Design an enzyme around this catalytic site. Structure first.
Site, short mmCIF file in Angstrom:
data_model
loop_
_atom_site.label_atom_id
_atom_site.label_comp_id
_atom_site.label_asym_id
_atom_site.label_seq_id
_atom_site.Cartn_x
_atom_site.Cartn_y
_atom_site.Cartn_z
N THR A 7 3.55 0.63 12.14
CA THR A 7 2.16 0.99 11.86
C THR A 7 1.49 0.02 10.91
O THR A 7 0.32 0.15 10.62
CB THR A 7 2.04 2.38 11.26
N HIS A 40 0.77 -1.24 0.00
CA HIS A 40 0.00 0.00 0.00
C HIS A 40 0.81 1.30 0.00
O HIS A 40 0.22 2.38 -0.04
CB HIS A 40 -0.96 0.00 1.19
#
Ligand SMILES: CCOc1ccc2nc(S(N)(=O)=O)sc2c1
Ligand SMILES: CCOc1ccc2nc(S(N)(=O)=O)sc2c1
Ligand SMILES: [Cl-]
Ligand SMILES: [Cl-]
Ligand SMILES: [Zn+2]
Ligand SMILES: [Zn+2]
Lengths: 212, 223
Positions: free
Chosen positions: B167, B64
């Site tokens: 994250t 992503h």
């Protein structure tokens, strides 16, 4: 069964696996930190207090919800006090023969723990009420002005749950030598100090507060 | 199978996809968070940068983000320990929120030292002037031209430092975060393209639970 006898805690229950896998497990040696001069932000709401119960691998004194600490806008209720010998937390490799832990929980379920070292010396009157149960001089228990270390850590006892806010006080309290061996005797003359855990360069601040 | 979409594979369910990812839920220093409570400190000058302009080993889309890999030529020195910048990748919006402020974009400088210990540096972007530092990459995704790493960051930076997690899955903890307050600038078009190169698919982990993280605010010179 878990004890301090002569690193395998994670094995005994899978609930204890974090004892190895966590990256912020306590106790530690406090060697690198940040000086700051910001407001205490730490308020004590302590009174002389008589125990909910007094009972024994560590010596523990528990309390009713009468004593509080308020930290950054959240109230933490005092649950209990217990002892570790030697001092679990190291300050630049200095440890004290005895320690006390003051355990708290807030609305969100967050943990805050208070740790302080003891110095072999004068008889300490605060210990005796516990050693109907006699009331403990909590608001008088602590030093007037404390220099403290604050950082994030874990329970030093299983399940070693993390998310614990530790404030480790610089000032040593005083304890007489008879009292020391007595509590040491009180703990079966068996040490209850978890060794220093792996420290991944924990962010530490040194600061001060007025406990009373 | 992890992604940021609202289906079975989003963040609220990342712990379910692999047992390697459960720390995403159970972990107690999960990033990102909102940085609003912190300690001001003596500026002992703990952090030293050693960046040069560098051409990416590869610039590619993976998991992503737009990621740029580097030869081990750019470095960070922290309290006498050096971390090699491994890569620079992007999140839109900026993942860490600074005093409850959200930015359209951020860049992460992932460093790993010898011990395998992780250090990540984050800086946000808000819409403005064309950024020449950015352009090598937006074309480079389509040899690679060098990136002015040495010119990328603000001269003097204000940043927040704390211990946290990755994250993205596996959400590993023990991560030393340096989140810089100063926003860099990006043109509205460059902004739209980065998002297009990162597929106009959000890649921002929501703010995670905060267990009273100790955060210090300090400053440094990147140049
Ligand atoms: C109901 C079980 O409560 C437990 C178990 C272990 C434990 N260790 C601490 S300490 N020594 O402050 O880090 S408190 C505590 C409470
Ligand atoms: C081993 C595969 O590398 C991974 C996986 C997840 C991951 N998240 C970051 S971030 N968003 O900076 O905290 S970097 C990174 C690298
Ligand atoms: Cl202690
Ligand atoms: Cl971010
Ligand atoms: Zn304890
Ligand atoms: Zn990232």
């Amino acid at each position: 069964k878990w004890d301090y006898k002569n690193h395998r805690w994670d094995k005994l229950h899978k609930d204890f696996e974090v004892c190895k896998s966590g990256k912020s497990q306590s106790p530690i040696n406090i060697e690198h930190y940040y000086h700051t001069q910001d407001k205490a932000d730490l308020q004590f709401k302590y009174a002389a207090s008589k125990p909910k119960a007094v009972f024994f691998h560590t010596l523990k004194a528990s309390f009713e919800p009468t004593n509080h600490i308020n930290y950054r806008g959240h109230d933490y209720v005092l649950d209990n006090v217990h002892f570790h010998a030697p001092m679990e937390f190291l300050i630049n490799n200095k440890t004290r023969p005895l320690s006390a832990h003051f355990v708290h929980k807030d609305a969100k379920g967050r943990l805050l723990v208070l740790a302080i070292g003891f110095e072999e010396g004068k008889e300490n009157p605060n210990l005796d009420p516990i050693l109907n149960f006699k009331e403990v001089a909590l608001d008088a228990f602590l030093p007037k002005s404390i220099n403290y270390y604050h950082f994030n850590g874990s329970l030093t006892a299983p399940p070693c749950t993390e998310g614990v806010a530790w404030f480790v006080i610089e000032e040593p309290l005083e304890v007489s030598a008879k009292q020391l061996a007595e509590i040491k005797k009180r703990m079966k003359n068996s040490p209850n100090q978890r060794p220093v855990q792996p420290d991944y360069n924990t962010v530490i601040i040194k600061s001060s507060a007025e406990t009373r």
